[PDB]
Curated annotation (Swiss-Prot):
The chain holds residues 1025 to 1191 of 7096 of the full protein. Responsible for the cleavages located at the N-terminus of the replicase polyprotein. Participates together with nsp4 in the assembly of virally-induced cytoplasmic double-membrane vesicles necessary for viral replication. Antagonizes innate immune induction of type I interferon by blocking the phosphorylation, dimerization and subsequent nuclear translocation of host IRF3. Also prevents host NF-kappa-B signaling. In addition, PL-PRO possesses a deubiquitinating/deISGylating activity and processes both 'Lys-48'- and 'Lys-63'-linked polyubiquitin chains from cellular substrates. The gene is rep. Residues 1-167 form the Macro domain. This is Papain-like protease nsp3. It is found in: Host endoplasmic reticulum membrane.
């Protein structure tokens, strides 16, 4: 049993809810919240900007030190950093950004990072301002992630479309 509430069960391991990942993280304090990161960990907008704003910019300060030491992530890659006030850990995952021309096949590699964690609160990778089709992102998530993932979908209209169209 875990603390996640109000989710619709899609599969054995994937759950979905219309919720802001920031408000959900604040309520649950999950072991792992996933950030929709870019390779530079520049948390300007979308999930990354809202998460970072909720940490009072502490996520960005930590991220800048990580990049200064390690250099940029790979598209499809990830790193584990602090969850600050939102979670124990933040798994920063880089899905391909279609609005930068990145290979959508890298979305499966991105979701494979989730398998290193038993339970996660996450957004749909490469959705929103990353430009991918969220229906596609949910299909790759279900077909790739084997650990227990609780997906937060901010947009109520999109949530309803994801549920209604789910095979
Ligand atoms: C998905 C879930 N929660 C969010 N909060 C801000 C953006 C976003 C996207």
């Amino acid at each position: 049993v875990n603390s996640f509430s109000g989710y619709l069960k899609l599969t054995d391991n994937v759950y979905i809810k219309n919720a802001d990942i920031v408000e959900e993280a604040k309520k649950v304090k999950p072991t792992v919240v996933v950030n929709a990161a870019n390779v530079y960990l520049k948390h300007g907008g979308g999930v990354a900007g809202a998460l970072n704003k909720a940490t009072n910019n502490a996520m960005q300060v930590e991220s800048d030190d990580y990049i200064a030491t390690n250099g940029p992530l790979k598209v499809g890659g990830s790193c584990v950093l602090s969850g600050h006030n939102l979670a124990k850990h933040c798994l920063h995952v880089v899905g391909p950004n279609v609005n930068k021309g990145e290979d959508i096949q890298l979305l499966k590699s991105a979701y494979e990072n989730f398998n290193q964690h038993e339970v996660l609160l996450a957004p749909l990778l490469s959705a929103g301002i990353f430009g991918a089709d969220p229906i596609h992102s949910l299909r790759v998530c279900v077909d790739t992630v084997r650990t227990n993932v609780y997906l937060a979908v901010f947009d109520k209209n999109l949530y309803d479309k994801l549920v209604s169209s789910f095979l």
